[PDB]
A = this chain, B = another copy of it.
Amino acid sequence: MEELEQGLLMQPWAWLQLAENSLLAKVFITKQGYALLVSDLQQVWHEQVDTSVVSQRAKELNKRLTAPPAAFLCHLDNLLRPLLKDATFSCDCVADALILRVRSELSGLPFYWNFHCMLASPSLVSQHLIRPLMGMSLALQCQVRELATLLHMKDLEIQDYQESGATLIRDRLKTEPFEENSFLEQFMIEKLPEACSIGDGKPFVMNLQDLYMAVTTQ
C-alpha cells in the first residue's frame, strides 16, 4: 500500500461542507486502499486503509449491497471537483476519532459509508502541513524579490526617458517611482490585516494550494 502516502502528498487540499463544521483535506485512492488527511483548523485527523476492512465495514453499513473493493474505492474517487459537483455529508467528533458519514446515489439508488479518523501523527503534520508551508513562505519571498528588481529595471528605462525627456502622452497614467520599503510599510498597514485571512482555509486552497502542489513533489 504505502505508496499511497506518496500520492497523498502529491494531492492538494480543498474545502467541504457540514452541519456542525466544515473541513479541509487531501486524499489518495487506488484499487488497494486509501490515504486520508482532514483538519478543522485546530487539529488534524488521518486514516489509511486496505481491502479487508473496506469489504467488512462496507458490508456492515450497507445492509443493502455487496460489492468488491476496486469499484468501491473508484466510487469514492467520484467525489467530483471539490466544489461543487452536483451527495450528503455529516460529521461527528468523539474520542481521538473523527467519524465522517457520507450518503450518495450511484444510479438513483442510495449509498451509505463512514470514515474512522484518529489524530494525525506529528511527523505527518510536518510532512503535509508544516515544512511545505514554510517553503511556500520563503519561495514567495524570493518571488517578491525578483518582482522588486523587475520593477526597478522598468524604473530605469522610464528614468532613461525622464532626464532626456520625451514628455509622455496621457499625462496622468505614469505611476510613482518604486520604493521597496515605502511599499512594504503601506502594505503592512493597509493590506496586511486581511491579506492573512485564516477564515476557513478557503482562501488558501486556490492560489496557495496550487503553489503548494508546486512545493510537495519537490
A residues lining the B interface (CB < 8 Å): 1-2, 41-44, 63-64, 66, 92-95, 97, 99, 114, 116, 119-120, 122-123, 125-127, 129-144, 146-148, 150-151, 153-162, 164-170, 172-175, 178, 183-184, 187-188, 191-198, 201, 203-204, 207-208, 210-211, 214-215, 218
Contacts and interface: CB of A to CB of B under 8 A. Distances in A.
A207 B137 CA distance: 9
8 contacts: A41-B131, A133-B134, A137-B140, A138-B195, A142-B194, A150-B183, A154-B154, A156-B173
Contacts of A170: 160, 164
A136 B137 contact: yes
A195 B144 contact: no
Contacts of A153: 173, 175
A195 B43 contact: no
Q: Give chain A's interface secondary structure class.
A: helix
Contact of A167 (B66, B154, B161): B161
A147 to B, nearest CB: 4
Contacts of A132: 196
A173 to B, nearest CB: 4
B168 A165 contact: yes
Contact of A157 (B42, B148, B158): B158
A157 B160 CA distance: 12
B144 A144 contact: yes
B95 A116 contact: yes
Contacts of A173: 153, 156-157, 159-160
A186 B155 CA distance: 22
A91 to B, nearest CB: 9
Contacts of A191: 139, 142-143, 146
Contact of A208 (B42, B138, B193): B138
Given A125-B125, A195-B142, A160 B168 contact: yes
A215 B197 contact: no
A33 to B, nearest CB: 13
Given A93-B94, A141-B140, A192-B215, A42 B126 contact: yes
